[PDB]
């Protein structure tokens, strides 16, 4: 997260300023939002379009052999 103090002081300082804001963590930026929504689609494909907030359920059966 942190190394070279001579740059680092300013650089890290600007990063925290981000966190210290709630119009986004200082801003967000369209570009990210566009990709987010895309990437969000894809991984739903990755593991099917059910919603794993709920779990599966099954049904039951039998037949006579002879």
């Amino acid at each position: 997260l942190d190394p070279v103090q001579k740059l680092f002081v300013d650089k890290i300082r600007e990063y925290r300023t981000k966190r210290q804001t709630s119009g986004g963590p200082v801003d967000a930026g369209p570009e990210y939002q566009q990709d987010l929504d895309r990437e969000l689609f894809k991984l739903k494909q990755m593991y099917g379009k059910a919603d794993m907030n709920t779990f599966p359920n099954f049904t039951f059966e039998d037949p006579k052999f002879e």
Partner: protein, 58 residues
């Protein structure tokens, strides 16, 4: 004379064997059949409930 002696000897033990072999089998094997299938039936269902508890949680 000696022919007839053996002819009934054959036929008699023949029907002894085949009938007694029929008798012994039927009990066990039919007892067999009932329990085998029940087996099969029941098994399936064990799995089917279970698997699912996996599938779902996954």
């Amino acid at each position: 004379q000696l022919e007839e002696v053996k002819q009934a000897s054959i036929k008699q033990i023949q029907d002894a064997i085949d009938m007694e072999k029929s008798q012994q089998a039927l009990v066990q094997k039919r007892h067999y059949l009932f329990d085998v299938q029940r087996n099969n039936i029941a098994m399936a269902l064990e799995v089917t409930y279970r698997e699912r508890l996996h599938r779902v949680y996954r």
